[PDB]
């Protein structure tokens, strides 16, 4: 793992010791190379997971997330070059350093064998994110957004720390290999129920749930493009990874302590997908779609069946890619008109014909167009739930309908229709942002070709 | 389309537009041309009968009774000229109506294939840059101070001046560009 | 009812301008510059080579792998002669009609 982390560190001196002109090229290229190096984790020729030390490891669940996190860095760097073009060299270097630190901390979190390192880094991913949001966001709601984002997470995480320390005092170690073989039934009691709550609510607030999801749209709306990308793609997957890892020691309390959360998720899916219809802000639309999608992940993880974990992993990967893509697409038009409203620019297929194919393909991946992996996850989650209770497919299906509806609405009222002739400032598409969409899309094709990689420990 | 409707609609205009809609819906019912001619003569007779009715109280009452009768026995699927609102080819070509400023972003390579056109275009742009201030002042200096406006534009009173606000009527993309 | 003297002059001016513009949209013979410039071989080029690769794939990968191509058994009829076994299916008992 050091062979993936130490290069990510040396990227920092490469960022600072580089000439102002060649600072972006070097870091971008070497980040691509590190994304390449991260592909050795897929060399799993057995059912024996990779343990590199007492601290670093990588299972079939953490490897996809690590590769996605190593691959998103250069895309964020690229997306973050049109803005920052008028900022000073030191500010650009500081932005790049924030992004690199995020990459490093996330790779650590996904490689961690122990839950205390996971927690420390889970929390350390707040500093660079908050800085990015509040320092390079454009409107004044930056600050309230950062506040929400900090304190939802911390108020959720503190109980998690208490519960981890309790488990330490009771068992002797917070290692994940040991806590899986040395396990005991949790006697059903209010104490252990509060332990379940403590262990879960931090992640549930980070996925997020329906009842607690207001920190996400504020951030995405008020966050620069890179922050939105990393947030949507990884900083939500963080909670699902945590739940999947920690739900082994909460058996069987998960059988009856889940109904509230399964239910909230299944219903908030509908609520959010419906919000995505009467929504003026494109970024808010993307965020509410993300919430609708993560609700399924939460429910799946709650029922903890193999099909369920598999669909959840696939949906995590695919949603990360496609949401990063949609935010890139939105910011493309934002850089022209400097407005987030989806009603102002509504004929962009008559000027950007190629960029519209990216909109089309993304909105098709947003909805479940097969054989996309955005669809296999939804399908296996639907199947797991149907097995759970045959009355879930009702809500699943109305969510499907609403999903198609608002994705089509997005692309229609944004690209199709009559062009806004007063928008003389609609410069053609930049090779850079086109490369961005291509790099977001092609990996989806490749995964759809080889889904065995993004299944997870269950398969 | 080219003209802006007035503040309110007079009575004669109301009657003429009712006449037009009635004759169109009647054409829609009376599909055959002879039938239509006959019932249109009848309709013109019905109109011309109360043509010299001077009073207004009864005029508006007749007009409203006629509007009621028209809403009744109204063809649900009336004929609608294709290129007109509600027609098959209404905005079928509004996707090829690319504005002109999309050429300011053209690449010199794309331009070298149409040199004469772009020379002419620069001529036009100079014309516009020259006429701008003059037409702006022509507008600001002849706004009725009564306080009520009319939405109609004035012509180029002075010679050598171009009519104000012409670059969007002129330069308007064609109606069937392919 | 009718165009006012001012609106009519406006229309005339806009009209001559429009009819100059549209005339300018007309192209000259030398533009676009556009620089610098076998009966049904499509059959071969688009059928034969593809058949070659597809026959390779089928015969040497799909077959040579189990339960890839499965054919509903061929119809056998009284009076026929099975090939491999040479078996002869007896004909049918004689109809009373």
């Amino acid at each position: 793992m050091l062979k993936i982390i130490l290069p990510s560190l040396m990227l920092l001196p490469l960022t600072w010791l580089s000439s102002p002109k060649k600072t972006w090229t070097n870091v971008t290229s070497y980040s691509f190379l590190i994304s390449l190096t991260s592909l050795t984790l897929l060399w799993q020729t057995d059912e024996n997971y990779k343990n590199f030390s007492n601290m670093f490891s990588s299972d079939p669940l953490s490897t996809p997330l690590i590769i996605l996190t190593a691959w998103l860095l250069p895309l964020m760097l690229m997306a973050s070059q049109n803005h920052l073009k008028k900022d000073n060299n030191v500010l650009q270097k500081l932005y790049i350093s924030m992004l690199i630190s995020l990459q490093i901390l996330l790779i650590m979190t996904f490689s961690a064998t122990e839950l205390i390192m996971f927690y420390i880094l889970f929390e350390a991913t707040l500093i660079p994110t908050l800085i990015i949001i509040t320092r390079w966001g454009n409107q004044t709601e930056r600050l309230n957004a950062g506040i929400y984002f900090l304190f939802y997470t911390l108020i959720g995480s503190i109980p998690l720390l208490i519960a981890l320390i309790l488990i330490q005092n009771h068992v002797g170690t917070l290692n994940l290999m040991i806590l899986s073989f040395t396990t005991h039934t949790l006697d059903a009691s209010w104490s252990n129920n509060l332990l379940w709550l403590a262990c879960m609510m931090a992640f549930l607030i980070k996925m997020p749930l329906y009842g607690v999801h207001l920190w996400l749209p504020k951030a995405h709306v008020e966050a620069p493009i890179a922050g939105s990308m990393i947030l949507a793609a990884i900083l939500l997957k963080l909670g699902s990874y945590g739940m999947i890892r920690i739900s082994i020691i909460l058996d069987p309390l998960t059988k009856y302590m889940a109904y509230p959360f399964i239910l909230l998720s299944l219903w908030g899916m509908i609520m959010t997908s419906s919000i995505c219809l009467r929504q003026t802000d494109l970024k808010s639309l993307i965020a509410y779609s993300s919430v609708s999608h993560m609700a399924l992940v939460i429910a799946s993880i709650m029922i903890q069946t193999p099909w369920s974990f598999m669909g959840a992993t696939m949906l995590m990967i695919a949603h990360g890619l496609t949401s990063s893509l949609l935010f890139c697409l939105a910011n493309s038009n934002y850089e022209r008109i400097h407005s987030r409203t989806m009603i102002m620019a509504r004929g962009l297929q008559m000027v950007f014909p190629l960029m519209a194919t990216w909109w089309l393909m993304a909105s098709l991946a947003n909805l479940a167009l097969p054989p996309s992996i955005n669809l296999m996850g939804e399908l296996f989650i639907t199947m797991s739930l149907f097995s759970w209770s045959n009355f879930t497919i009702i809500l699943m299906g109305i969510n499907i309908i609403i999903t198609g509806m608002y994705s089509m609405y997005m692309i229609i009222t944004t690209q199709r229709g009559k062009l806004t002739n007063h928008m003389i400032n609609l410069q053609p598409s930049h090779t850079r942002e086109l490369t961005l969409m291509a790099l977001h899309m092609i990996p989806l094709i490749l995964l759809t070709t080889s889904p065995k990689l993004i299944t997870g420990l269950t398969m | 389309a080219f003209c802006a409707p007035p503040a309110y609609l007079t009575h004669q205009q109301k009657v003429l537009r009712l006449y037009k809609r009635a004759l169109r819906h009647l054409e829609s019912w009376c599909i055959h041309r002879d039938k239509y001619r006959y019932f249109a003569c009848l309709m013109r007779a019905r109109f011309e009968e109360h043509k010299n009715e001077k009073d207004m109280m009864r005029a508006t009452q007749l007009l409203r009774e006629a509007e009621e009768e028209f809403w009744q026995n109204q063809h649900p699927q009336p004929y609608i000229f294709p290129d007109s609102p509600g027609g098959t080819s209404f905005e079928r070509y509004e996707c090829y109506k690319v504005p002109e400023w999309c050429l300011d972003y053209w690449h010199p390579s794309e331009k070298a294939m149409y040199p004469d056109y772009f020379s002419k275009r620069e001529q036009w742009k100079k014309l516009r840059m020259e006429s701008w201030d003059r037409e702006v002042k022509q507008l600001q200096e002849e706004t009725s101070p009564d306080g009520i406006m009319t939405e109609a534009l004035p012509p180029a009173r002075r010679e050598g001046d171009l009519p104000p606000l012409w670059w969007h009527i002129v330069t308007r993309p064609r109606e069937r560009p392919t | 009812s009718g165009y006012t003297p001012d609106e009519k002059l406006r229309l005339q001016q806009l009209r001559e301008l429009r009819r100059r513009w549209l005339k300018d949209q007309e192209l000259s013979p030398r533009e676009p510059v556009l620089p610098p410039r076998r009966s049904s071989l499509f059959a071969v080029s688009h059928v034969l080579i593809p058949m070659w690769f597809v026959h390779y794939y089928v015969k040497y990968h799909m077959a040579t792998k189990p339960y890839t191509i499965v054919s509903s058994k061929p119809r056998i009829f009284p009076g026929d002669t099975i090939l491999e076994t040479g078996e002869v299916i007896p004909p049918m008992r004689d109809f009373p009609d």
Binding site: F352, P428 | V98, E100, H107, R174, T178 | Q25, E26
Partner: peptide, 12 residues
């Protein structure tokens, strides 16, 4: 007879 067809910049 032929006419210039207006189009965006498709070079990029």
């Amino acid at each position: 007879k032929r006419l210039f067809v207006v189009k965006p910049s498709l070079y990029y």
